[PDB]
Amino acid sequence: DEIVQREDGSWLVDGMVSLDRFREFFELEAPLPGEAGGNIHTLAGVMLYQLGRVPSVTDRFEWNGFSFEVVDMDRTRVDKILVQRH
């Protein structure tokens, strides 16, 4: 898994992580936002679908009992996401 667990249980996840692997890790079945459109295969792809083409650091949403927050951009790349299961 292209992700590392923090002291509070949350994960710093690279945006290049595939959704198949993301769902396998967290034991999910549900497609992430935008995945049904057929164009999206990575966590960063979902971030841009949900938050727009150039999101900002701290931009955040909830999905299926998880929160996702942009914690690092590299120019237009959504490079690192903070993921947290409630």
Residues at the site binding a copy of itself, with contacts judged by CB under 8 A: 4-7, 12, 56-58, 60, 69, 71-72, 74, 79-80, 82
* Residue 74 annotated as part of some ligand binding site: yes
Residues contributing to the site for Ca ion (CB under 5 A): 72, 74, 79
Q: Indicate which of a copy of itself, Ca ion, none lies near residue 32 (CB less than 5 to 8 Å, by partner kind).
A: none
**DSSP symbols for 12-68:** EEETT-BHHHHHHHHT--SPPTTGGGS---BHHHHHHHHH-SS--TT-EEEETTEEE
Binding residues: 72-74, 79
